[PDB]
CSV table of C-alpha atoms in Angstrom, one decimal:
chain,number,residue,atom,x,y,z
L,1,UNK,CA,0.0,0.0,0.0
L,2,UNK,CA,1.6,3.2,-1.2
L,3,UNK,CA,2.0,6.3,0.9
L,4,UNK,CA,0.9,9.7,-0.4
L,5,UNK,CA,2.0,13.1,0.9
L,6,UNK,CA,-0.4,15.9,0.3
L,7,UNK,CA,0.5,19.5,1.3
L,8,UNK,CA,-2.2,22.2,1.5
L,9,UNK,CA,-1.2,25.7,0.4
L,10,UNK,CA,-2.9,29.1,-0.1
L,11,UNK,CA,-3.6,32.5,1.6
L,12,UNK,CA,-4.5,32.7,5.3
L,13,UNK,CA,-8.1,33.7,4.5
L,14,UNK,CA,-8.8,30.5,2.6
L,15,UNK,CA,-9.6,28.3,5.6
L,16,UNK,CA,-6.9,25.6,5.0
L,17,UNK,CA,-7.1,24.4,8.6
L,18,UNK,CA,-10.9,24.2,8.6
L,19,UNK,CA,-10.9,22.2,5.4
L,20,UNK,CA,-8.5,19.6,6.9
L,21,UNK,CA,-10.3,19.4,10.3
L,22,UNK,CA,-13.7,19.1,8.5
L,23,UNK,CA,-12.4,16.3,6.3
L,24,UNK,CA,-10.7,14.3,9.0
L,25,UNK,CA,-13.2,14.8,11.8
L,26,UNK,CA,-16.8,13.8,12.6
L,27,UNK,CA,-19.4,16.5,13.3
L,28,UNK,CA,-17.0,19.3,12.2
L,29,UNK,CA,-18.5,22.6,13.1
L,30,UNK,CA,-18.0,22.6,16.9
L,31,UNK,CA,-18.2,25.5,19.4
L,32,UNK,CA,-14.5,26.2,18.7
L,33,UNK,CA,-12.5,25.7,15.5
L,34,UNK,CA,-8.9,24.8,16.4
L,35,UNK,CA,-5.9,26.8,15.1
L,36,UNK,CA,-3.6,23.8,14.8
L,37,UNK,CA,-4.0,20.8,12.6
L,38,UNK,CA,-1.1,18.4,13.3
L,39,UNK,CA,0.3,16.3,10.4
L,40,UNK,CA,-2.3,13.6,9.7
L,41,UNK,CA,-1.9,10.1,8.3
L,42,UNK,CA,-4.6,7.5,7.6
L,43,UNK,CA,-5.6,4.7,5.2
L,44,UNK,CA,-8.2,6.0,2.7
L,45,UNK,CA,-10.1,3.9,0.1
L,46,UNK,CA,-10.3,5.3,-3.5
L,47,UNK,CA,-11.8,3.3,-6.3
L,48,UNK,CA,-11.4,0.1,-4.3
L,49,UNK,CA,-7.7,0.8,-3.7
L,50,UNK,CA,-6.2,1.5,-0.2
L,51,UNK,CA,-3.7,4.3,0.2
L,52,UNK,CA,-2.0,5.9,3.2
L,53,UNK,CA,-2.9,9.6,2.9
L,54,UNK,CA,-0.6,12.1,4.6
L,55,UNK,CA,-1.9,15.6,5.1
L,56,UNK,CA,0.2,18.6,6.1
L,57,UNK,CA,-1.3,22.1,6.8
L,58,UNK,CA,0.8,25.2,6.2
L,59,UNK,CA,-1.3,27.7,8.2
L,60,UNK,CA,0.9,30.4,9.8
L,61,UNK,CA,3.6,30.2,7.2
L,62,UNK,CA,2.0,32.6,4.7
L,63,UNK,CA,4.5,35.4,5.3
L,64,UNK,CA,7.7,33.3,5.4
L,65,UNK,CA,8.8,32.3,1.9
L,66,UNK,CA,11.9,30.4,2.8
L,67,UNK,CA,10.2,28.4,5.7
L,68,UNK,CA,7.3,27.2,3.5
L,69,UNK,CA,9.5,25.2,1.0
L,70,UNK,CA,10.9,23.2,4.0
L,71,UNK,CA,7.6,21.3,3.8
L,72,UNK,CA,7.7,20.7,0.0
L,73,UNK,CA,10.3,17.9,-0.6
L,74,UNK,CA,8.7,14.5,-1.4
L,75,UNK,CA,5.2,16.0,-1.9
L,76,UNK,CA,3.1,13.8,-4.1
L,77,UNK,CA,0.3,16.3,-4.7
L,78,UNK,CA,-0.5,19.9,-3.8
L,79,UNK,CA,-3.8,21.5,-3.0
L,80,UNK,CA,-3.5,25.1,-4.0
L,81,UNK,CA,-6.5,26.8,-2.3
L,82,UNK,CA,-8.2,30.1,-2.7
L,83,UNK,CA,-11.5,31.4,-1.2
L,84,UNK,CA,-14.3,31.8,-3.7
L,85,UNK,CA,-15.3,35.0,-1.8
L,86,UNK,CA,-11.8,36.5,-1.8
L,87,UNK,CA,-10.5,37.8,-5.2
L,88,UNK,CA,-7.2,38.7,-3.4
L,89,UNK,CA,-6.6,35.0,-2.5
L,90,UNK,CA,-7.6,34.0,-6.1
L,91,UNK,CA,-5.1,36.4,-7.6
L,92,UNK,CA,-2.3,35.0,-5.3
L,93,UNK,CA,-2.8,31.6,-6.9
L,94,UNK,CA,-1.1,32.9,-10.1
L,95,UNK,CA,1.0,35.5,-8.5
L,96,UNK,CA,2.3,33.6,-5.4
L,97,UNK,CA,1.4,29.9,-5.0
L,98,UNK,CA,1.7,28.4,-8.4
L,99,UNK,CA,5.2,30.0,-9.1
L,100,UNK,CA,6.5,28.9,-5.7
L,101,UNK,CA,5.2,25.3,-5.9
L,102,UNK,CA,6.4,24.8,-9.5
L,103,UNK,CA,9.8,26.3,-8.7
L,104,UNK,CA,10.4,23.7,-5.9
L,105,UNK,CA,8.4,20.9,-7.4
L,106,UNK,CA,8.5,21.0,-11.2
L,107,UNK,CA,6.5,17.8,-11.8
L,108,UNK,CA,4.2,17.5,-8.8
L,109,UNK,CA,0.4,17.5,-9.7
L,110,UNK,CA,-1.7,20.5,-8.5
L,111,UNK,CA,-5.4,20.4,-7.6
L,112,UNK,CA,-6.8,23.9,-7.6
L,113,UNK,CA,-9.5,24.2,-4.8
L,114,UNK,CA,-12.0,27.0,-4.4
L,115,UNK,CA,-13.1,27.0,-0.7
L,116,UNK,CA,-16.0,28.7,1.1
L,117,UNK,CA,-18.5,27.6,-1.5
L,118,UNK,CA,-21.3,28.2,1.0
L,119,UNK,CA,-20.6,31.9,1.1
L,120,UNK,CA,-20.7,32.4,-2.7
L,121,UNK,CA,-24.5,33.1,-2.6
L,122,UNK,CA,-24.5,34.9,0.8
L,123,UNK,CA,-26.1,38.3,0.4
L,124,UNK,CA,-24.0,40.0,3.1
L,125,UNK,CA,-20.8,38.6,1.6
L,126,UNK,CA,-21.7,39.6,-2.0
L,127,UNK,CA,-22.6,43.1,-0.7
L,128,UNK,CA,-19.3,43.5,1.2
L,129,UNK,CA,-17.4,42.6,-2.0
L,130,UNK,CA,-19.6,44.9,-4.1
L,131,UNK,CA,-18.5,47.8,-1.9
L,132,UNK,CA,-14.9,47.1,-3.0
L,133,UNK,CA,-16.0,46.9,-6.7
L,134,UNK,CA,-15.4,43.1,-6.4
L,135,UNK,CA,-17.3,39.9,-7.2
L,136,UNK,CA,-17.1,36.3,-5.9
L,137,UNK,CA,-15.1,34.0,-8.1
L,138,UNK,CA,-17.4,32.1,-10.5
L,139,UNK,CA,-16.9,28.5,-11.6
L,140,UNK,CA,-15.7,29.5,-15.2
L,141,UNK,CA,-13.1,31.9,-13.7
L,142,UNK,CA,-11.8,29.1,-11.4
L,143,UNK,CA,-11.7,26.7,-14.3
L,144,UNK,CA,-9.8,29.2,-16.4
L,145,UNK,CA,-7.2,29.7,-13.5
L,146,UNK,CA,-6.7,25.9,-13.3
L,147,UNK,CA,-6.0,25.6,-17.0
L,148,UNK,CA,-3.7,28.7,-16.8
L,149,UNK,CA,-1.6,27.1,-14.0
L,150,UNK,CA,-1.8,23.5,-15.4
L,151,UNK,CA,-3.7,22.1,-12.5
L,152,UNK,CA,-4.8,18.4,-13.0
L,153,UNK,CA,-8.3,19.3,-11.6
L,154,UNK,CA,-10.3,22.3,-10.4
L,155,UNK,CA,-12.8,21.6,-7.6
L,156,UNK,CA,-15.1,23.8,-5.3
L,157,UNK,CA,-15.9,22.9,-1.7
L,158,UNK,CA,-17.3,24.0,1.6
L,159,UNK,CA,-15.6,23.1,4.9
L,160,UNK,CA,-18.8,24.1,6.6
L,161,UNK,CA,-21.3,21.9,4.8
L,162,UNK,CA,-18.7,19.4,3.6
L,163,UNK,CA,-20.1,19.7,0.0
L,164,UNK,CA,-17.4,18.7,-2.5
L,165,UNK,CA,-14.9,18.0,0.4
L,166,UNK,CA,-14.5,14.2,-0.1
L,167,UNK,CA,-14.1,14.7,-3.8
L,168,UNK,CA,-11.1,17.1,-3.3
L,169,UNK,CA,-9.1,14.4,-1.5
L,170,UNK,CA,-10.3,11.5,-3.7
L,171,UNK,CA,-9.1,13.6,-6.7
L,172,UNK,CA,-5.8,14.4,-5.0
L,173,UNK,CA,-5.2,10.7,-4.6
L,174,UNK,CA,-6.2,9.9,-8.2
L,175,UNK,CA,-3.7,12.5,-9.4
L,176,UNK,CA,-1.0,10.4,-7.9
L,177,UNK,CA,-2.3,6.9,-8.7
T,9,UNK,CA,-14.4,34.4,28.2
T,10,UNK,CA,-15.5,30.9,27.0
T,11,UNK,CA,-13.6,31.6,23.8
T,12,UNK,CA,-10.6,32.6,25.9
T,13,UNK,CA,-10.7,29.2,27.7
T,14,UNK,CA,-10.8,27.3,24.4
T,15,UNK,CA,-7.8,29.2,23.0
T,16,UNK,CA,-5.7,28.8,26.2
T,17,UNK,CA,-6.6,25.1,26.4
T,18,UNK,CA,-5.5,24.7,22.8
T,19,UNK,CA,-2.2,26.6,23.4
T,20,UNK,CA,-1.4,24.3,26.4
T,21,UNK,CA,-2.6,21.0,24.9
T,22,UNK,CA,-0.7,21.6,21.6
T,23,UNK,CA,2.4,22.6,23.7
T,24,UNK,CA,2.1,19.2,25.5
T,25,UNK,CA,1.6,17.4,22.2
T,26,UNK,CA,4.7,19.2,20.7
T,27,UNK,CA,6.9,18.2,23.6
T,28,UNK,CA,5.6,14.6,23.3
T,29,UNK,CA,6.4,14.7,19.5
T,30,UNK,CA,10.0,15.9,20.1
T,31,UNK,CA,10.4,13.3,22.8
T,32,UNK,CA,9.1,10.5,20.5
T,33,UNK,CA,11.3,11.5,17.6
T,34,UNK,CA,14.4,11.5,19.9
T,35,UNK,CA,13.4,8.2,21.6
T,36,UNK,CA,13.0,6.4,18.2
T,37,UNK,CA,14.7,7.8,15.1
T,38,UNK,CA,17.6,9.5,16.9
T,39,UNK,CA,18.1,6.6,19.4
T,40,UNK,CA,18.2,4.1,16.6
T,41,UNK,CA,21.0,6.1,14.9
T,42,UNK,CA,23.1,6.4,18.0
T,43,UNK,CA,22.4,3.2,19.9
T,44,UNK,CA,20.3,0.9,17.7
T,45,UNK,CA,21.2,-2.7,16.5
T,46,UNK,CA,20.4,-2.4,12.8
T,47,UNK,CA,23.0,-1.3,10.2
T,48,UNK,CA,23.2,2.4,9.5
T,49,UNK,CA,23.9,3.7,6.0
T,50,UNK,CA,27.5,5.0,5.6
T,51,UNK,CA,26.4,8.4,4.4
T,52,UNK,CA,24.4,9.2,7.6
T,53,UNK,CA,26.5,7.5,10.2
T,54,UNK,CA,27.7,9.9,12.9
T,55,UNK,CA,25.7,12.7,11.3
T,56,UNK,CA,22.7,12.8,13.7
T,57,UNK,CA,23.6,16.5,14.4
T,58,UNK,CA,22.9,17.4,10.8
T,59,UNK,CA,19.7,15.3,10.6
T,60,UNK,CA,18.1,16.4,13.9
T,61,UNK,CA,19.8,19.8,14.1
T,62,UNK,CA,19.3,21.3,17.6
T,63,UNK,CA,16.1,19.4,18.4
T,64,UNK,CA,17.5,18.4,21.8
T,65,UNK,CA,18.2,22.0,22.8
T,66,UNK,CA,14.6,22.8,21.6
T,67,UNK,CA,13.1,19.9,23.6
T,68,UNK,CA,15.1,20.9,26.8
T,69,UNK,CA,13.8,24.5,26.5
T,70,UNK,CA,10.1,23.6,26.1
T,71,UNK,CA,10.2,20.6,28.6
T,72,UNK,CA,12.3,22.4,31.3
T,73,UNK,CA,11.0,25.9,31.0
T,74,UNK,CA,8.4,26.9,28.5
T,75,UNK,CA,5.6,24.3,29.1
T,76,UNK,CA,5.8,24.9,32.8
T,77,UNK,CA,5.6,28.7,32.3
T,78,UNK,CA,2.5,28.4,30.0
T,79,UNK,CA,0.8,26.1,32.5
T,80,UNK,CA,1.3,28.8,35.2
T,81,UNK,CA,-0.7,31.3,33.0
T,82,UNK,CA,-3.4,28.5,32.4
T,83,UNK,CA,-6.1,30.7,34.0
T,84,UNK,CA,-4.5,34.0,33.2
T,85,UNK,CA,-5.0,34.2,29.4
T,86,UNK,CA,-4.8,38.0,29.3
T,87,UNK,CA,-1.3,37.9,30.7
T,88,UNK,CA,0.3,35.0,28.8
T,89,UNK,CA,2.0,37.4,26.4
T,90,UNK,CA,4.6,38.1,29.1
T,91,UNK,CA,5.8,34.5,28.9
T,92,UNK,CA,6.8,34.9,25.2
T,93,UNK,CA,8.5,38.3,26.0
T,94,UNK,CA,10.5,36.9,29.0
T,95,UNK,CA,11.7,33.9,27.0
T,96,UNK,CA,12.2,35.7,23.7
T,97,UNK,CA,15.9,35.0,23.7
T,98,UNK,CA,15.5,31.2,23.8
T,99,UNK,CA,13.3,31.2,20.6
T,100,UNK,CA,16.5,32.3,18.7
T,101,UNK,CA,17.4,28.5,18.6
T,102,UNK,CA,14.6,28.2,16.0
T,103,UNK,CA,16.7,30.3,13.6
T,104,UNK,CA,19.5,27.7,14.0
T,105,UNK,CA,17.0,24.9,13.4
T,106,UNK,CA,15.5,26.4,10.3
T,107,UNK,CA,18.9,27.3,8.8
T,108,UNK,CA,20.0,23.7,9.2
T,109,UNK,CA,16.8,22.1,7.8
T,110,UNK,CA,17.7,22.0,4.1
T,111,UNK,CA,20.9,20.2,5.0
T,112,UNK,CA,19.0,17.6,7.1
T,113,UNK,CA,16.5,17.0,4.3
T,114,UNK,CA,19.3,16.6,1.7
T,115,UNK,CA,21.2,14.1,3.9
T,116,UNK,CA,18.0,12.1,4.4
T,117,UNK,CA,16.9,11.9,0.7
T,118,UNK,CA,20.4,11.3,-0.7
T,119,UNK,CA,22.0,9.0,1.9
T,120,UNK,CA,19.4,7.4,4.3
T,121,UNK,CA,17.6,5.3,1.7
T,122,UNK,CA,14.8,3.4,3.5
T,123,UNK,CA,16.6,3.4,6.9
T,124,UNK,CA,14.1,5.6,8.7
T,125,UNK,CA,11.0,4.2,6.9
T,126,UNK,CA,12.1,0.8,8.3
T,127,UNK,CA,12.4,2.2,11.8
T,128,UNK,CA,8.9,3.7,11.4
T,129,UNK,CA,7.5,0.3,10.4
T,130,UNK,CA,9.2,-1.5,13.2
T,131,UNK,CA,8.1,1.0,15.9
T,132,UNK,CA,4.6,1.2,14.4
T,133,UNK,CA,4.9,5.0,14.2
T,134,UNK,CA,2.3,7.1,12.6
T,135,UNK,CA,4.7,9.9,11.9
T,136,UNK,CA,7.7,9.6,9.4
T,137,UNK,CA,11.0,11.1,10.3
T,138,UNK,CA,10.2,14.0,8.0
T,139,UNK,CA,6.9,14.6,9.7
T,140,UNK,CA,8.6,14.9,13.1
T,141,UNK,CA,11.4,17.1,11.7
T,142,UNK,CA,9.1,19.7,10.2
T,143,UNK,CA,7.3,20.1,13.6
T,144,UNK,CA,9.5,22.8,15.1
T,145,UNK,CA,9.1,24.8,11.9
T,146,UNK,CA,5.3,24.5,12.1
T,147,UNK,CA,5.3,25.2,15.8
T,148,UNK,CA,7.3,28.5,15.6
T,149,UNK,CA,4.8,29.7,13.0
T,150,UNK,CA,1.7,28.7,15.1
T,151,UNK,CA,2.3,30.7,18.2
T,152,UNK,CA,1.5,34.0,16.5
T,153,UNK,CA,-1.9,32.6,15.3
T,154,UNK,CA,-2.9,31.6,18.8
T,155,UNK,CA,-1.8,35.0,20.2
T,156,UNK,CA,-3.7,36.7,17.4
T,157,UNK,CA,-6.9,34.8,18.5
T,158,UNK,CA,-6.4,35.8,22.1
T,159,UNK,CA,-5.8,39.4,21.1
T,160,UNK,CA,-9.2,39.5,19.3
T,161,UNK,CA,-11.3,38.4,22.4
T,162,UNK,CA,-9.4,40.8,24.7
T,163,UNK,CA,-9.8,44.7,24.9
T,164,UNK,CA,-7.4,47.6,24.3
T,165,UNK,CA,-5.4,48.5,27.4
T,166,UNK,CA,-5.1,45.1,29.0
T,167,UNK,CA,-2.9,42.2,27.9
T,168,UNK,CA,0.8,42.2,27.2
T,169,UNK,CA,-0.6,39.9,24.5
T,170,UNK,CA,0.5,42.4,21.8
T,171,UNK,CA,4.1,42.4,23.2
T,172,UNK,CA,4.1,38.6,23.1
T,173,UNK,CA,2.7,38.6,19.6
T,174,UNK,CA,5.4,41.1,18.4
T,175,UNK,CA,8.1,38.7,19.6
T,176,UNK,CA,6.4,35.7,18.0
T,177,UNK,CA,6.1,37.4,14.6
T,178,UNK,CA,9.8,38.5,14.9
T,179,UNK,CA,11.2,34.9,15.5
T,180,UNK,CA,10.0,33.3,12.2
T,181,UNK,CA,10.8,36.6,10.4
T,182,UNK,CA,14.4,36.3,11.6
T,183,UNK,CA,14.6,32.6,10.7
T,184,UNK,CA,13.2,33.5,7.2
T,185,UNK,CA,15.6,36.5,6.8
T,186,UNK,CA,18.5,34.3,7.7
T,187,UNK,CA,17.7,31.8,5.0
T,188,UNK,CA,17.8,34.6,2.5
T,189,UNK,CA,21.1,35.9,3.9
T,190,UNK,CA,22.7,32.5,3.3
T,191,UNK,CA,21.9,32.8,-0.4
T,192,UNK,CA,24.1,35.9,-0.7
T,193,UNK,CA,27.2,35.4,-2.9
T,194,UNK,CA,30.0,37.7,-3.8
T,195,UNK,CA,29.8,39.7,-0.6
T,201,UNK,CA,29.3,40.8,11.0
T,202,UNK,CA,28.4,43.5,10.3
T,203,UNK,CA,25.4,44.3,12.5
T,204,UNK,CA,21.9,42.9,12.9
T,205,UNK,CA,19.7,42.2,9.9
T,206,UNK,CA,16.6,44.4,10.1
T,207,UNK,CA,14.9,43.8,6.7
T,208,UNK,CA,15.3,41.9,3.5
T,209,UNK,CA,13.1,42.2,0.4
T,210,UNK,CA,13.5,42.5,-3.4
T,211,UNK,CA,13.5,46.0,-5.1
T,212,UNK,CA,14.3,47.6,-8.4
T,227,UNK,CA,17.3,41.9,-3.4
T,228,UNK,CA,18.1,44.2,-0.5
T,229,UNK,CA,19.6,43.5,2.9
T,230,UNK,CA,19.3,46.3,5.4
T,231,UNK,CA,21.6,45.9,8.4
T,232,UNK,CA,22.2,48.3,11.3
T,233,UNK,CA,25.2,49.9,9.7
T,234,UNK,CA,25.2,48.6,6.1
T,235,UNK,CA,22.7,48.5,3.2
T,236,UNK,CA,23.4,45.7,0.7
T,237,UNK,CA,22.1,45.4,-2.9
T,238,UNK,CA,22.0,41.9,-4.6
T,239,UNK,CA,20.7,40.3,-7.8
T,240,UNK,CA,18.9,36.9,-7.8
T,241,UNK,CA,20.6,34.6,-10.2
T,242,UNK,CA,21.4,30.9,-10.6
T,243,UNK,CA,24.8,29.1,-10.1
T,244,UNK,CA,26.5,27.1,-12.8
T,245,UNK,CA,25.4,24.2,-10.5
T,246,UNK,CA,21.8,25.6,-11.0
T,247,UNK,CA,21.6,26.8,-7.4
T,248,UNK,CA,19.5,30.0,-7.0
T,249,UNK,CA,21.2,32.7,-5.1
T,250,UNK,CA,21.8,36.5,-4.7
T,251,UNK,CA,24.8,38.0,-6.4
T,252,UNK,CA,26.2,40.9,-4.4
T,253,UNK,CA,26.2,44.1,-6.6
T,254,UNK,CA,26.6,47.2,-4.5
T,255,UNK,CA,26.6,48.6,-0.9
T,256,UNK,CA,25.8,51.8,0.9
T,257,UNK,CA,26.5,53.1,4.5
T,258,UNK,CA,24.2,54.9,6.9
T,259,UNK,CA,23.5,58.4,5.5
T,260,UNK,CA,21.5,58.8,2.2
T,261,UNK,CA,17.7,58.9,2.8
T,262,UNK,CA,15.0,59.7,0.3
T,263,UNK,CA,11.3,59.9,1.4
T,264,UNK,CA,8.9,59.5,-1.6
T,265,UNK,CA,5.8,57.3,-1.4
T,266,UNK,CA,3.8,58.3,-4.5
T,267,UNK,CA,4.6,58.3,-8.2
T,268,UNK,CA,1.9,58.8,-10.9
T,269,UNK,CA,-0.8,56.1,-10.2
T,270,UNK,CA,1.8,53.4,-9.6
T,271,UNK,CA,3.3,51.4,-6.7
T,272,UNK,CA,5.7,53.1,-4.2
T,273,UNK,CA,9.1,54.4,-5.3
T,274,UNK,CA,11.7,56.0,-3.0
T,275,UNK,CA,15.4,57.1,-2.8
T,283,UNK,CA,21.7,67.9,-1.4
T,284,UNK,CA,20.1,65.1,-3.5
T,285,UNK,CA,19.5,64.0,-7.1
T,286,UNK,CA,17.1,61.7,-9.0
T,287,UNK,CA,19.7,58.9,-9.4
T,288,UNK,CA,18.5,56.8,-6.4
T,289,UNK,CA,15.4,54.7,-7.2
T,290,UNK,CA,13.9,51.9,-5.1
T,291,UNK,CA,10.6,50.3,-5.9
T,292,UNK,CA,8.5,48.3,-3.4
T,293,UNK,CA,5.5,46.0,-4.3
T,294,UNK,CA,2.8,47.1,-1.8
T,295,UNK,CA,2.1,50.2,0.3
T,296,UNK,CA,2.6,48.4,3.6
T,297,UNK,CA,6.0,47.0,2.6
T,298,UNK,CA,7.1,50.6,1.6
T,299,UNK,CA,6.1,51.9,5.1
T,300,UNK,CA,8.4,49.3,6.8
T,301,UNK,CA,11.7,50.2,5.1
T,302,UNK,CA,11.2,54.0,5.6
T,303,UNK,CA,10.6,53.5,9.4
T,304,UNK,CA,13.4,51.0,9.7
T,305,UNK,CA,16.2,52.8,7.8
T,306,UNK,CA,15.4,56.0,9.9
T,307,UNK,CA,15.8,53.9,13.0
T,308,UNK,CA,19.4,53.2,12.3
T,309,UNK,CA,20.2,56.7,10.9
T,310,UNK,CA,19.7,58.2,14.4
T,311,UNK,CA,21.4,55.1,16.0
T,312,UNK,CA,24.7,55.6,14.1
T,313,UNK,CA,24.7,59.4,14.9
């Protein structure tokens, strides 16, 4: 049974830690969402094939460009994440995350993940962006970004509702197998 | 206040888990190298100091001093910032750890083969050696997030939280700055205050160093030293003509361009700090 190392990267606003906790844990949204997700390892089944899935968070490292790559060696697949309700985080995919990942890991598959899908139709969120002359990131725009950066797959999800969450990690595994 | 209890519990429990993690790593992977029965690859034999860096120094600090200090503030979350301030000096050991990390990794992937993976299997360990070895890097980067969360559920004029936060943003900044400094080629003396690329700069207490990012003939990416200036010439300009920030008897010859407005603000403040210091 092969081992898979998956590293989650993206801006601080993206909810990387929430995504990981929601995926790995039962009854996710508790009274308190933890700041720390320790390196996780478990056997997962994808298409009737067992794999040992390793997950590493990078939360807290967003401002330290020489510390981040310390986590990159031997990575089998990256999740590059942006929030569907943060155009800033989306722009940093092409401007920050893709260049960095590709520099250190020329041949490692990338899954592009749009997080906070539950907020995309939230009136208050849309209005807050509108005040900054901004709009939530649409599916076509996300798809376009994925093709632009050569991601193996583009996927949208919500840590909160867990919609699309399982598929993110299934597809990360399939990108390696 | 309930929020405060959750944050403090997380800080303490993750500190305990971190200490346990370091102890596990040293009990297993390290012990096998120094005292184990199985053959050790020739390329890693007697090189445990490269592989594990100063992990033992880090463990001793947290186990003997820092965890005990945190547990003392267990029900005084407003005042836990003081702990980080008091022990600021000790966290410098993380600069050492981070600087050594690339060497550890290289030695593992090139010379260890499956030696550590076999130990992992034998000990029934969930964490690989690489998983343990990244933990200090993750930890030194998590403190500031926990202190930020505390800061938000406290009010202005009561804490020392902010002072603790300042320290814990400074430590990974200094580790990161040091990694950049090691890439400088073609170039004591003074403390490194800022580094960033402009149109790569290293601002020390009494020197200002200009570099250019290039690649070696070996393909290794580094900063080629180009020029240097001493503490004198300052030029304060923030605006251009609908563009990012550009700054410098004086002439127009001196041009420096920062990416964002916030980054521009830093350098101005920090250069001026060591202009009055040298005079």
